[PDB]
Structure 1
Amino acid sequence: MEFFGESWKKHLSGEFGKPYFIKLMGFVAEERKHYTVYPPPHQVFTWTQMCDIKDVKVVILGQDPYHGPNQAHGLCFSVQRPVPPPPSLENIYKELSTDIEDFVHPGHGDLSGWAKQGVLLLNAVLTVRAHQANSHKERGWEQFTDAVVSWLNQNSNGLVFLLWGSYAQKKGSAIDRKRHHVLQTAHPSPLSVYRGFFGCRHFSKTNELLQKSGKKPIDWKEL
C-alpha cells in the first residue's frame, strides 16, 4: 500500500490480505471518519521509509504512538520539529549525555537521523485516537508488528534489541538470543526511569555489540 517502503513491502505485504489486517484497516478508516487519529495516514509507516529492511541493525520496541497534536509521526519516541521532546525522550537524551562521548542535545526530538542508520523505532500499536492513549490497542496492530519482529528474528543476524519496560520485554520475549542481542531495562518514562534506565548505558553497549559482529556502529549524535 501507499507510503510503505519497497523492501519492507516485499517481505510484509503477505500480511495485508489476511483477514485480521483487512479488519484492522476498516477499523482505523472508520475511526478517522469521526476522530482525529495520530499519526496522519502518510506517517503511519514512516519506520519503513528510513532504511532498507536488511539494513536494520538496532530495534527499539515501543507501545502506543504519542496522542497529542503534532507529536507522533511513525517512529517511536520521536517528535518532528518544532515539537519539544516529551519526557520519555528527554530522559533518553539525558542517558545519552552520560553514555556517549560529547553527545549534544539538539533541542528537537526528531530521531530520523537514527532511523536512517538502521535503528528501527517500532511501536507495537501504530495508530491512536487523539488524546486517548491505548485507544487502538488489541485491534490488529499487535499481530502485525509481531510479524515484523518475527521476520527480523528469523531473517536478520546479530540485531540488537533494546527492550525498555514490561510491554517491550514481552513483545521481544521470543527473540533468539543466540542469533541476536537483547538488552533489557526499565522504561525511560519519568514513572520508571529511575528503576534501571538511568545508568543502563544501552547505547554504548549497542555499538560495542555491533562492532564485535563486524558492523558499523550507530552515531547516536547524528540527529
Structure 2
Amino acid sequence: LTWHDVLAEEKQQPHFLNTLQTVASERQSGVTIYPPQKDVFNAFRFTELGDVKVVILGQDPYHGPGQAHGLAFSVRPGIAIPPSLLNMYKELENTIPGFTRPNHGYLESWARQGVLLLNTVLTVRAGQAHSHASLGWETFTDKVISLINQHREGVVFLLWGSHAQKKGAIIDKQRHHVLKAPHPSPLSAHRGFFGCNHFVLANQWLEQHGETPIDWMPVLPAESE
C-alpha cells in the first residue's frame, strides 16, 4: 500500500489540482517559489507510507535560495544550518548518547530511516513566510495526516508548536504515539523545546515495539571516484 494508492483520489480534487496550478502560475509571474517543483513532494519520495516510523510536522518551507528542498527543517548540502535546525541539534546533543553537532543541515538520511518530514504547507514565495498558506495545501496535508492515522499503526508523531499540535488533534493517541512541545525556533525553543527529549522518547517507543530506532546523526551523500 503506497502513498499513491491512498492519495490518488485526493489528488484529483479541484482544491489540490488548483493549488498546483496556482503554484505553476506563480513560478512564471515574476516571483520565485520554493522549493523547486520537482522537490515539493520529496517527503513522500523518501519515506513511503509503509516506511513511516516518525512524523515530524513543520509548517512553512524555508523561503531563501538553496534552503528548502521538500523535507521539513532540512537544508541542502553546503547551506548554513537554519536556527530551528540548530536548536533541534542542540536538544539532540544534550540527549542522544554520542551525538555531536553536524557540519551540515541535510536530513535526507532521517527520511530514509522512516522519519516523515512533512510541512503542512508545501510551497512558499521567496522571502515571504506563509505566503502560500491559504492555497489548498493545508487541506491536502490534513488528508495526508488522516490517512497515516488510519492506514498505519504505532507511528510516533512529534508535534512542535500550536499549529502542528492542532493539526494532529485527530490522531488516535492510543493507536499512535503523540508527543508535544513548543517549536524549536529561537522564539519558543527555550520555553519548552529544550528539555522535551522527543528524540530519545521516539526511539524508546520504536524499540518497545520491535522497530529499529532512528540514528539521528544526519549524513551527507558520499563522494564517488
Same fold (TM over 0.5): yes
The one of 123, 127, 131 equivalent to 2:127 is 131
Does 1:184 pair with 2:186? no
The one of 190, 193, 197 equivalent to 1:197 is 193
Runs ≥4 in structure 1, deviation > 4 angstroms? none
Q: Secondary structure at the match of 2:180?
A: strand
Q: Aligned-pair distance for 1:11? A: 1.9
* Aligned twin of 2:137: 141
The one of 36, 59, 76 equivalent to 1:63 is 59
* Aligned twin of 1:29: 24
Does 1:10 pair with 2:5? yes
RMSD: 1.1
> Would the aligned equivalents of 2:102 and 2:218 in 1 still touch at CA under 8 Å?
no
Q: Which structure 1 segments of 5+ residues have no match?
A: 1-5
Q: Distance in 2 between matches of 1:94 and 1:30?
A: 39
Instruction: In structure 2, give the amino acid aligned to 1:27.
Output: T
Q: Please, what TM-score do these two structures have when normalized by structure 2?
A: 0.94
Give deviations 1:104-154, integer Å, cap 9, x for gaps. Answer: 222100000100000000000000011110000121100101111000000
Give the share of equivalent positions with the same residue, in percent: 56
Does 1:49 pair with 2:45? yes
Q: Aligned-pair distance for 1:222? A: 4.4
Does 1:77 pair with 2:61? no
Q: Which structure 2 segments of 5+ residues have no match?
A: 220-225
* Aligned twin of 1:215: 211
Q: Aligned-pair distance for 1:15? A: 1.3
* Aligned twin of 2:161: 165
Does 1:117 pair with 2:113? yes
Q: Distance in 1 between matches of 2:135 and 2:149?
A: 23
Q: Please, what TM-score do these two structures have when normalized by structure 1?
A: 0.95
Number of residues of Structure 1 aligned to a counterpart in Structure 2: 218
* Aligned twin of 1:3: none
